[PDB]
Structure formats: structure tokens, C-alpha cells
Design a binder for this molecule. Structure first.
Ligand SMILES: [Mg+2]
Ligand SMILES: [Mg+2]
Lengths: 241, 241
């Protein structure tokens, strides 16, 4: 009865079952130890400011299939990474199970310059959409790419795969079949001062680089036509051209 | 009240009053003798096939400010023009005042190869959008441009100005602030076999060329951002990239 996707959650994730919460729906990867995709639904009632960050192992997963807080010891000193959210805390922290935004199934080792720079500026504009009187929902899917070796967390002996990039696919209101949409993709090494508007892509490119089908309940002809066309939602988020 | 525009009818027309019908809202030009813009609203109840075409002077205008059927005599032979509709007959003739679609305020001398070629193929895809289950409206504004000398109807002594081009701006459902949109512009001499997908433009180009502001009730920030960005509605009409 919780629908975080509206037009069908993504197919193609490594796990056949996904975790469904009020905060998000997530598909875990027991090999990489990170979520393949995280889908969430911002409304006027979901943002909350100032919540704290008590990182915790996700209790719904086997502990061997995800990370624990200990696994991040030394990671910033070794790799210049932060504990980066997939589903964003401030946009969703009013939901009834908000503490799950700080479960490590919703976190990856994200380079600090990306986390605190363009990724954060995109989060801020994504959240600001919901303040518009005619925007009642923002539906987003976000996740990693795994395309080059980014190193290993020094604080764990677990096999894991740090992402090489992160993407976000967004639409407003009811469905990308009728409503504006956007897709963005950022390498881990994105400079801190980068403008997030320079990282617009198509949904098709993200699918091709992930093995996923996003918005998988849309009709075939809608998928074929809109997924290879960059959307115009970024123009409402301050972007030009 | 009949609202054929949803987000504000255009400003900048030469007439300070517009004619409002179920079939369309139009703003006449008493100098050119043709409408500056015609706005219309397709719903599932508006299409009707096979209607007849009794061209008639628009009774709501002064006859000196518009054409009469006699004014078209010899025009096809001399100029290779048709009596081309602005608001399209087959998309709208289910409404109660449908014969007004064949009033000459809704007609211009439009080259036959445009009327019967790319302009008709765009009309067909525009009308087909309303068959999609999630599309409940198509709102369109269309009109002429006057940018070069096109010659004169041979069958009249009235002063008039034949258009050199035609434009069409389309969105679905409630508002281009949240819903897909399109804009197209075609020279009179567009080849008969042209692909209408090759004539996509921005709304800003049409405004700068016409002197109008389309969708004039939108907030300033929405107008600035979307009017310089080509829309993605054409991808649902069969167009690629
Ligand atoms: Mg972050
Ligand atoms: Mg026609």
C-alpha cells in the first residue's frame, strides 16, 4: 500500500525483493553492499529540517549483505569520502519511519566534494520543487554506477564495491508520460564547485549503465520515446538550455 | 465563461477584444484581415469527422475587417493556396458552434502543399494525443507570421496581407508549468512531403517574431525558463531526438 514510484519501481536490480518503507523503497545488492536503486516520494508533508544522523545497520537485511557503522572507520582519511545519502534526509525526514534514512542501506562512500557540492545543490533544488503551489509530488529514483575501481574501505574485511558515479531521475506530480522530468549523472570525482546543471543526461543512458529499467510500468511507446530525450524539469530548477 | 487557453490567452493582439466560442477564441486583425492568433481546446468530446465546409463571413466582425467567400475566387489557381483552417475542423467540430470553424476569421490563404502536407500531419498527431487515456486536454494556440511579401488574393479589392508562415504552440492537460509542451513553425513554402518533426522551435522564437506573449497568465519565472527550452511533447507525437 506504499507506492514510492507511481509508474512502477525499477526492474533489473540484483535482489528479487525490495524493502518498502514510508521513507523510500530500496533494492539492496548483497555483493556490492550498497543499494542498486532507491525510490522516494517528496510531498509538502515530507521535508523536515535539523534531524540528526545516527548511522545504523539496516535491521531488515542480513548483516552480511550490507554495511555496519564500524565499516566506515578511517574511510574519510583514506578515500576523502563521506557517508552520503541516496534518499535525501532533509526532503523526507518528516515521514513516519524517517530514522531509516540513516540506515546504511541508504548510504554509500561518496566523495566529499560531490556530496557537499553539486549533489547537495541538486538535492536543494529537488526539494524546492515541492514548494510550488502546482507541484504536489516529486518522485525520484537514485542510485550508483559501478564502472571503475574506487578503492576499498579500510575499516572492513567485507567484500564491497564503492560506486564510481551517482544518478538521479526525477519527475513531478503523476507520471513522466504527461509531466516534466529530469535525469542527472555525476562522477565521484565531480569538483566541489561544479554546477549540477552541467550533468543532465537521458534516462536511457542511466539504464544502459546500470542494467535497470526505470519507470518500468510505463507503456512501451512512452518508454522508448521519452527515455532518450533529456527532459525540461531542470529548467524549473534554475538550469538553462 | 469559456476558457480556451487555461493559462491565459495571448497578449499583444491588434484587437483589444477577442471572440470567444466553444470552437475557439480568436483575436482578429482588421489590417491583415486574418486572425493574429486562435486558441482552442481539444477534449475527448470535440473531434468530429466528415463535417462539411460552408465558408462564411464571420457575422461577429465588421465585414470590412475580415474576408468574405468571394475574396478567395481564383486564389488556388494564381497562388496555389487553399482556404486553410487555423483551428482545425476535425479536431473541434463536436462543439455546439462548430460551423464557426468555417468562418473566414478562422481561415487564411495557406499554400496547399503546407495545408495538405506537414501542417495536416501535425494536426493529425495533435488530435491523436487525446486518445491517450491519461491525456484529458490538448490546449493549442496557432497563428500567422508576416515577414515577406506574399502577393495578393486576385479576387478581392480589400487591403489584406497574406501570411508568410504559421506557428503552433501546444500543451497537454492543465498547464505547461507542469505538463509536456511543443512549438512548431512552418514557412508557407514548406515542401509537401516535409516531416513536421523538423520544424520544432521555442515559444520565445514565436513570441519575438509575432509580437505576442503566449500563455500570458503564467508566472514570470515559469515563462522565462520554459519559453526558451524546446519541449518534449513532440516525442509523444512520433518525433525522435
Ligand atoms: Mg548528501
Ligand atoms: Mg488545413
Amino acid at each position: 500500500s506504499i507506492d514510492n514510484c507511481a509508474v512502477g519501481c525499477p526492474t533489473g536490480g540484483s535482489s528479487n525483493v525490495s524493502i518498502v518503507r514510508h521513507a523510500y523503497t530500496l533494492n539492496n545488492n548483497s555483493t556490492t553492499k550498497f543499494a542498486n536503486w532507491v525510490a522516494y516520494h517528496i510531498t509538502k508533508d515530507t521535508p523536515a529540517s535539523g534531524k540528526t544522523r545516527n548511522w545504523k545497520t539496516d535491521p531488515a537485511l542480513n548483516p552480511a549483505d550490507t554495511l555496519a557503522p564500524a565499516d566506515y572507520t578511517g574511510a574519510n582519511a583514506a578515500l576523502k569520502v563521506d557517508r552520503g545519502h541516496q534518499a535525501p534526509l532533509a526532503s523526507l525526514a518528516g515521514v513516519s519511519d524517517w530514522e531509516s534514512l540513516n540506515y546504511l542501506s541508504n548510504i554509500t562512500p561518496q566523495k566529499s566534494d560531490l556530496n557537499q557540492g553539486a549533489w547537495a545543490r541538486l538535492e536543494d533544488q529537488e526539494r524546492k520543487l515541492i514548494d510550488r503551489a502546482d507541484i504536489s509530488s516529486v518522485y525520484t529514483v537514485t542510485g550508483p554506477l559501478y564502472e571503475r575501481d574506487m578503492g576499498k574501505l579500510p575499516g572492513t574485511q567485507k567484500a564491497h564495491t564503492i560506486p564510481s558515479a551517482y544518478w538521479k531521475v526525477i519527475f513531478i506530480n503523476n507520471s513522466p508520460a504527461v509531466n516534466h522530468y529530469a535525469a542527472f549523472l555525476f562522477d565521484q570525482n565531480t569538483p566541489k564547485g561544479a554546477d549540477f546543471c552541467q550533468f543532465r543526461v537521458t534516462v536511457d543512458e542511466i539504464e544502459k549503465r546500470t542494467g535497470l529499467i526505470i519507470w518500468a510500468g510505463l507503456p512501451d511507446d512512452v518508454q522508448a520515446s521519452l527515455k532518450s530525450k533529456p527532459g525540461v524539469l531542470p529548467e524549473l530548477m534554475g538550469c538553462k538550455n
